[PDB]
Amino acid sequence: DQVQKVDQYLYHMRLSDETLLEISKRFRKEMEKGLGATTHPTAAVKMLPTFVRSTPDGTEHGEFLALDLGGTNFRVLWVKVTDNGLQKVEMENQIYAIPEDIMRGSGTQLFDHIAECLANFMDKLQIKDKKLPLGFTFSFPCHQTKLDESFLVSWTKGFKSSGVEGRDVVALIRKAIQRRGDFDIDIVAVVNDTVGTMMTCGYDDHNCEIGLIVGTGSNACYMEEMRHIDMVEGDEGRMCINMEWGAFGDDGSLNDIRTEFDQEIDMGSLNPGKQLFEKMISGMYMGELVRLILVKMAKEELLFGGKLSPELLNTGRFETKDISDIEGEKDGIRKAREVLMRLGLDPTQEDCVATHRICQIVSTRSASLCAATLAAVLQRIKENKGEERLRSTIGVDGSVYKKHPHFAKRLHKTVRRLVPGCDVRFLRSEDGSGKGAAMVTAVAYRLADQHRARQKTLEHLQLSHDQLLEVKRRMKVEMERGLSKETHASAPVKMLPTYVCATPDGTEKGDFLALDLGGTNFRVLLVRVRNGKWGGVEMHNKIYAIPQEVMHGTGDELFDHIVQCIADFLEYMGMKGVSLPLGFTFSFPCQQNSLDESILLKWTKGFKASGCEGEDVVTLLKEAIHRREEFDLDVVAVVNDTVGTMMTCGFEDPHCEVGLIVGTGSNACYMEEMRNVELVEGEEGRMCVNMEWGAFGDNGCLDDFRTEFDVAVDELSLNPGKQRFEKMISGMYLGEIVRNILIDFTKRGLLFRGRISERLKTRGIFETKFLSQIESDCLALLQVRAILQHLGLESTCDDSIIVKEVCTVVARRAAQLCGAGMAAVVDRIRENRGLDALKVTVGVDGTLYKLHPHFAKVMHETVKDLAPKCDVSFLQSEDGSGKGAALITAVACRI
Ligand SMILES: N#Cc1ccc(S(=O)(=O)NC[C@H]2O[C@H](O)[C@H](NC(=O)c3cccc(-c4ccccc4)c3)[C@@H](O)[C@@H]2O)cc1
Ligand SMILES: N#Cc1ccc(S(=O)(=O)NC[C@H]2O[C@H](O)[C@H](NC(=O)c3cccc(-c4ccccc4)c3)[C@@H](O)[C@@H]2O)cc1
Numbered sequence: 001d002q003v004q005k006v007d008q009y010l011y012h013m014r015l016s017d018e019t020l021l022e023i024s025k026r027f028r029k030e031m032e033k034g035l036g037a038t039t040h041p042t043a044a045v046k047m048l049p050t051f052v053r054s055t056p057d058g059t060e061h062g063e064f065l066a067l068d069l070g071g072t073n074f075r076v077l078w079v080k081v082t083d084n085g086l087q088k089v090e091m092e093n094q095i096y097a098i099p100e101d102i103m104r105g106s107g108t109q110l111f112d113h114i115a116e117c118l119a120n121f122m123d124k125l126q127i128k129d130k131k132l133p134l135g136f137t138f139s140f141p142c143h144q145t146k147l148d149e150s151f152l153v154s155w156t157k158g159f160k161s162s163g164v165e166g167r168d169v170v171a172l173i174r175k176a177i178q179r180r181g182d183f184d185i186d187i188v189a190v191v192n193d194t195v196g197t198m199m200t201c202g203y204d205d206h207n208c209e210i211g212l213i214v215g216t217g218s219n220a221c222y223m224e225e226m227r228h229i230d231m232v233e234g235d236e237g238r239m240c241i242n243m244e245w246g247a248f249g250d251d252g253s254l255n256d257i258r259t260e261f262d263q264e265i266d267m268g269s270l271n272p273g274k275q276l277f278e279k280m281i282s283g284m285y286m287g288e289l290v291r292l293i294l295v296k297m298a299k300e301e302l303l304f305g306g307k308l309s310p311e312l313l314n315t316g317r318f319e320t321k322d323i324s325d326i327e328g329e330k331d332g333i334r335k336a337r338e339v340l341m342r343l344g345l346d347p348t349q350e351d352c353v354a355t356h357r358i359c360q361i362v363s364t365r366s367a368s369l370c371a372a373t374l375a376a377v378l379q380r381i382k383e384n385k386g387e388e389r390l391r392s393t394i395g396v397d398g399s400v401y402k403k404h405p406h407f408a409k410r411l412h413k414t415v416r417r418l419v420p421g422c423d424v425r426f427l428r429s430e431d432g433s434g435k436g437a438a439m440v441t442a443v444a445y446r447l448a449d450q451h452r453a454r455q456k457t458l459e460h461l462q463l464s465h466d467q468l469l470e471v472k473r474r475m476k477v478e479m480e481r482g483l484s485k486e487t488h489a490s491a492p493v494k495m496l497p498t499y500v501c502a503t504p505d506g507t508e509k510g511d512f513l514a515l516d517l518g519g520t521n522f523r524v525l526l527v528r529v530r531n532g533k534w535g536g537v538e539m540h541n542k543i544y545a546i547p548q549e550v551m552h553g554t555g556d557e558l559f560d561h562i563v564q565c566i567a568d569f570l571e572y573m574g575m576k577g578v579s580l581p582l583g584f585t586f587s588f589p590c591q592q593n594s595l596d597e598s599i600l601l602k603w604t605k606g607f608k609a610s611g612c613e614g615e616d617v618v619t620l621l622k623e624a625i626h627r628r629e630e631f632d633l634d635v636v637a638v639v640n641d642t643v644g645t646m647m648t649c650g651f652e653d654p655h656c657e658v659g660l661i662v663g664t665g666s667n668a669c670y671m672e673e674m675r676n677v678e679l680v681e682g683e684e685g686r687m688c689v690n691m692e693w694g695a696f697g698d699n700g701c702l703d704d705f706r707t708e709f710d711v712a713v714d715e716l717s718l719n720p721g722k723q724r725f726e727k728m729i730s731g732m733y734l735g736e737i738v739r740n741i742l743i744d745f746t747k748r749g750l751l752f753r754g755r756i757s758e759r760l761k762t763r764g765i766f767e768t769k770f771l772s773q774i775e776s777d778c779l780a781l782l783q784v785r786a787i788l789q790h791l792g793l794e795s796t797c798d799d800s801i802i803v804k805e806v807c808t809v810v811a812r813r814a815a816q817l818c819g820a821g822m823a824a825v826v827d828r829i830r831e832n833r834g835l836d837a838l839k840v841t842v843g844v845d846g847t848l849y850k851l852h853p854h855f856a857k858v859m860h861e862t863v864k865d866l867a868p869k870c871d872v873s874f875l876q877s878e879d880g881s882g883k884g885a886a887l888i889t890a891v892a893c894r895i
Helices: 002-009 018-036 107-124 169-180 195-203 260-267 275-281 284-298 320-326 332-342 349-385 397-403 407-418 433-457 465-483 555-572 617-626 641-652 708-716 724-729 733-745 770-775 782-788 795-835 847-851 855-866 883-893
Strands: 062-069 074-081 092-095 132-140 140-145 150-152 185-190 207-216 218-225 237-240 392-395 423-430 509-516 521-530 536-545 581-586 636-641 656-662 667-675 686-690 836-847 870-876
Touching: 002 349, 002 883, 018 407, 062 107, 062 433, 074 107, 074 795, 074 847, 092 107, 092 555, 092 836, 107 185, 132 169, 132 433, 150 169, 185 433, 195 207, 195 218, 195 237, 195 392, 195 433, 207 237, 207 349, 207 397, 207 883, 218 397, 260 275, 260 284, 275 284, 275 349, 284 349, 284 397, 320 332, 320 349, 332 349, 349 392, 349 423, 349 667, 397 407, 397 870, 407 423, 433 733, 465 617, 465 795, 465 855, 509 555, 509 883, 521 555, 521 770, 521 883, 536 555, 536 641, 536 733, 536 883, 555 617, 581 883, 617 636, 636 641, 636 883, 641 656, 641 667, 641 686, 641 836, 641 883, 656 795, 656 847, 667 724, 667 795, 708 724, 708 733, 724 733, 724 795, 733 770, 733 795, 770 782, 782 795, 795 836, 795 855, 795 870, 836 883, 855 870
Parallel strands: 062 132, 132 185, 207 392, 392 423, 509 581, 581 636, 656 836, 836 870
Antiparallel strands: 062 074, 074 092, 140 150, 207 218, 218 237, 509 521, 521 536, 656 667, 667 686
16 A cells, blocks of 8 residues: 555656657657768767678687776687587686776776787687687777777776777777787777677577667667668668667657656766666666655655665665565565665665565666667667568676566566567577677678678679680581581571571662561561651551460461451551551471471470461461452561561661570571572572571580589470570570579578578579669669569568679679670671671660660670670660561562
């Protein structure tokens, strides 16, 4: 009953969950004030970059050194880290003392002392001939510009040493070590005690993204995304922030929470108006905060018969330790009586249950405020990872939480209410920031080892100028043997004659039909040509689908259906009754004997239509046109789609002798001298050749460039060992190469935390449109993370950087090999004519050339560098697939 009198007296120190969640919202604004460039100089929560770029993943290994300077004594530590799967850290340390002589003395004397102790420790500890990282955690206020550079703002706890404040403490420890000359030190890291706590816990639990200390002081750190950290340059990846939240409220943002006892401790402190959040929650001030509630209640005659004692009025005489005791004993109000008597009072039972209760109120308020600001931190980690349910572990240290009986549990229960959208685990750190500082340099080496590891794989996909010139000539060599009559049949690149013998001039006019047929949906095309200067080409299409009934039926039914569509189209343009010549794009394997004769070899892509294979496709087509009555169309020619792409850029540019398509497929064509084409009789004139160059390398001629990933794609394709040059440069394949690289890294622990999604094992997930967005993303790489979340993969910042890099390397090699092939073509076009300076144009189509951000560029420079004499322009075509078929006809019609 004295209880509810107490609670009604202390009502403003019992905080509703509502108040806590409004404190979280305030703290989140304070976090954003510190992270932002313009608001940070006046921000009370300093949000200091720590330069730690990663938590531990567990595979760290090595030997490391550490210093902990807390003052009047420091420790020198040695941490053995073994990757055996146990994650069991081996430690040794020693304390040594800095006496007032050195302490109040000069800076360089102070560090010469420290450098000596370190060497005395390495001497005792065996290791002094080893060059090891350090390892540096000291808590005095600092301005930290680098992992290895931190400036002393001021001293604390009795350090007067001159020449230190405003001077880099790493330069001081390093210069001292040079002066001794007996040992040497590797990379240094300067790490705050919370960051140390996070790091050491994260070596056991790799979900630990928050360090926490409720000590005599209180502070917390978390992992944070570089896009939100204005004070450090770059938006990629994440970095740990030292929040310094003890200073929360220094500008008065908590003054409606803070009671008068809170006011009075601030005035009685060493640092008035500083660290007000600490002074509410933490160990130094917590028992003192009970002292004042006792003093004032007794001055009001609600306790002790209005009577005081000289000890009750001395600051510090009622201690945090006295709270832990009173709340911890079975009989708490006897241990209360005992503590009160020690202070010179004669308590009653009601005086003791009152003192007991005030203790719970103060200690519960401390654990609740922590929850509040832990709630804001948890909340932001949630929004950054961007999923609804969160697993995150908090490493925790400090004497309040470890040694006070109920506070850890209260914190656990309160945090978990305040954030129901989280599964949160707490893990206490024992050996403290001695381990932690060391572990920061272990992770620093791990990141390096892994970076070099995965950059050593990506070198196999990086080709030299000399490697490309080799494949350039392996292209020519294997072009020649396709033209000559002997070797054509053994030849992977068949160099098939197109029977397209003449390119445009300004003369052509009139309307032409075009039929682009492959796969289940064709298009019918009307193409109108305007001759003369200016003018150009005008196109109308319509798309039709071949019913599933029709392609599992007879072959004549297939082409009647096709002809109904042609008849529907030109009646849709309003031409019904008009007869026109027709160009024809048929993409199936075909031996083409004439320009208007081509024999279907084998059906593909799900056409079962009978009576077709082994037949000339144009006869089938016009035998189907004959049938329709009254319907007459002249079928002039049939073409490979590359040939069309080139002829399409023949009308823009007089000089275009070369088609190219880097598509879902890849192929290329030039006009070769009739001299050199040995399967067609006669030497007079020139002839366009359909290279079918995606087959470059199916004899093995590329097999020394082919990485295991190229072979992984090759072996699980529908056409194993066929079309290899295609599978390096285009289409479905590059995503698959990327995917197999990623799988490789992840098996090696180099990506995705070692863990392969079943969703990562799914073929085809990386589509060329996604590689295009990936490689065109920059800065924070939020577009890569989105895509990765879209495909069901881990979206973390660090994994984006790699995925982006793997993509860029795969796509570069693709353009580069594509230039080296296109360079062979333009050089032999020179060598056929004995010419040297040669100006050429390449019409180009296909999905990846137009839409990939860097690909068109990279290939341009590749053929400039590999074919120095040729001057090569590339003109984009746009649907030379079907439109080129009509335009091959208009030139054919000119004869
Ligand atoms: N001197 C101490 C000390 C260390 C550890 C402990 S402790 O280990 O017992 N508690 C952990 C936390 O205590 C304090 O809040 C520390 N901040 C401050 O005292 C403080 C106070 C005012 C300003 C700045 C500042 C300013 C600029 C840059 C860095 C720091 C820091 C915080 O850095 C530490 O992480 C206890 C006491
Ligand atoms: N089916 C398709 C298709 C069509 C267009 C596209 S595409 O329009 O996206 N790219 C254009 C190029 O793709 C591939 O290289 C094509 N080669 C083959 O299909 C191929 C594949 C294997 C063997 C032989 C062969 C070899 C010797 C003789 C005859 C034929 C040809 C090529 O005809 C086309 O020039 C993508 C895919």
